[PDB]
Amino acid sequence: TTSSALKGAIQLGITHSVGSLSQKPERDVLMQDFEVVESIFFPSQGSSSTPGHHHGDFKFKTYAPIAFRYFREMFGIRPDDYLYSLCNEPLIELSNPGSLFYVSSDDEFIIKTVQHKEAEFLQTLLPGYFMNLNQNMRTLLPKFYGLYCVQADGKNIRIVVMNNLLPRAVPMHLKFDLKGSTYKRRASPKERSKGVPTYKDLDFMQDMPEGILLENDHYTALSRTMQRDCRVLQSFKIMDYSLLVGIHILMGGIPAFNSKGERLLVFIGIIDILQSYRTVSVHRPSFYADRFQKFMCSTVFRK
Amino acid sequence: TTSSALKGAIQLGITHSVGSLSQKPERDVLMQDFEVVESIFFPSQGSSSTPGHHHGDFKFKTYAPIAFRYFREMFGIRPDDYLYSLCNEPLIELSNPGSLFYVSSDDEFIIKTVQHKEAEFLQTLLPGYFMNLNQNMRTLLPKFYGLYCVQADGKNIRIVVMNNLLPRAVPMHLKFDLKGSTYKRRASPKERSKGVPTYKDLDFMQDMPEGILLENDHYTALSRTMQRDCRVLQSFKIMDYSLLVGIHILMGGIPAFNSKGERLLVFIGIIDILQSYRTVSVHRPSFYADRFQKFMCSTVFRK
């Protein structure tokens, strides 16, 4: 039960870590806060912790606690809802190729697994992530809610908690994953035997040759924050990220769009961020991010 | 003419540096931006610059240009007004013991001189200063508008541009400079032969034994952002700063206050910041900042 052992510790780990944060009074974030790493150990019969069929014996670390309560707050995630969704309702597994990929019962939170490299990375990129939120409210970047580590019998599973663009609340008729490149960028046979498959660039150019149409006001805004997100991402030497796009042929938090003659609710966000600088040229990530926006404006079309 | 040589270069230096920034389109700040140092050289007869009786021959460096346009913007300093006030109206000198202390004609900007140490410092503390603005709008900290350096015949005069709490627009009947300490913290004989002298702690405790009274709403707010500013300052290992307080016995941007029976417009802000970590204990700055607020609540009184 590699999984059930993890599944429980994560729920038990967060209840404590975040629960006990909520007794302390809130106070602004300082630079020092991004580097903190608070831990706590979870024995079977520890008074101040709890025992468990899950909690056989382990330690639970949470990175940058105070930054993440900020980030949650700024995302509008009331902590009661956070730790209800995660720790109180049986979260559910999901195949997606040692790394796991869990999801909340309410399907508003993804819990991914991440390698030591990709995790320490994220950690270093918190201050830019902060500088981003506070300057670009409509940022299509991933919404990171938390970063933790379940150290288990001499092995560390580190995990990231984040939003889940396309939640299941509103149905998705179409899903595209887009990089602005082309090579082997079709869907696998397996993938198109799904119900609402996630197509890719080449698929999009033959299946949606007419673009996805937007009114000048909505397009302007989108162009604007693509450009901005791309400038950030570029700054961090990041690449191989894609624009996940949920089409809904109609809390409609989407944009006003049109097919080749019909009303739409698109739903989009940038994904697969944590990958940068470990042999690409010094001007590669720039090229990648130009290609990106320039292409997302044969994807999202105007007038 | 050590001074007139500086006075002109500063005006000529900023016009160019900031003027030419305004042709480029605005774009968000990134962490990389805090470390940039842009320069430009000012010969007598340089086409793309200008000549000058002031500009005999010098180089002009501006630190973190893009962060400072952000900070200006956030302070509501329209750049046309910035470089009119500074570069277009004859700024005026001021004794205040090689360091000079200029002021704008309109008296809305102080131009101080700073040593290599205190300047590089400020530079390192920009990201926290950013994290502060964006989290505490009513921050009693200094408003840094710009940081530059006039390299002159093989010597660097570095200078800081900032707000000027008590401007002369509204008259100041009383001025206090307060640290929450006491030792040799009286006014010099010279100082009290001024018109509107800047008294200090001991003076304040005998001259204002009745506090400075505030209504629960206004006091709450003040307490709150003292506490917060002090937490920031503490974080940066900073001390020997004071609360400059302008009393006006009545664009009234002050707070509602009362004397021992009369209406008031107080005007306050934290000053003398750039001094930290260069032999004080690891918990000294904390002690300094506790003393501070705890004392500023025998200075600013409630109910």
Author numbering:
A (entry chain A), B (entry chain A): 57 to 153, 157 to 309, 357 to 384, 402 to 426
Please give sentences taken from the publication describing this entry.
In this work, we present the first crystal structure of a PIP5K1 molecule.
The locations of Lys-171 (from the conserved ‘IIK' motif), Asp-299 (MDYSL) and Asp-378 (IID) in the three-dimensional structure of PIP5K1A suggest that they are functionally equivalent to Lys-72, Asp-166 and Asp-184 of PKA, which participate in ATP binding and catalysis. In PIP5K1A, the turn between β8 and α4c is compact. The side chain of Arg-244 is potentially hydrogen bonded to the main chain carbonyl oxygen and side chain carboxylate group of Asp-236, and pushes the side chain of Lys-238 into the active site. Size-exclusion chromatography/multi-angle laser light scattering (SEC/MALLS) indicates that the kinase has a molecular weight of 90 kDa, suggesting that the protein is dimeric in the solution. The crystal structure reveals that the dimer has a side-to-side arrangement, involving both N- and C-lobes of the kinase. Most residues constituting the dimeric interface are found within three structural elements: the loop between α1 and α1a, α4b, and α6. α4b is near the centre of the dimer, and interacts with its symmetric mate (α4b*) through hydrophobic contacts mediated by Pro-186, Phe-189 and Met-190. The negatively charged Asp-84* from the α1*–α1a* loop is matched against a positively charged patch (Arg-287) on α6, while Leu-86* forms hydrophobic contact with Val-291. Unfortunately, the specificity loop (zPIP5K1A residues 386–401), in which the primary determinant of substrate specificity lies28, is disordered in the PIP5K1A structure as in the PIP4K2B structure (Rao et al.), and therefore it remains difficult to rationalize the preferences of PIPKs towards different lipid substrates.
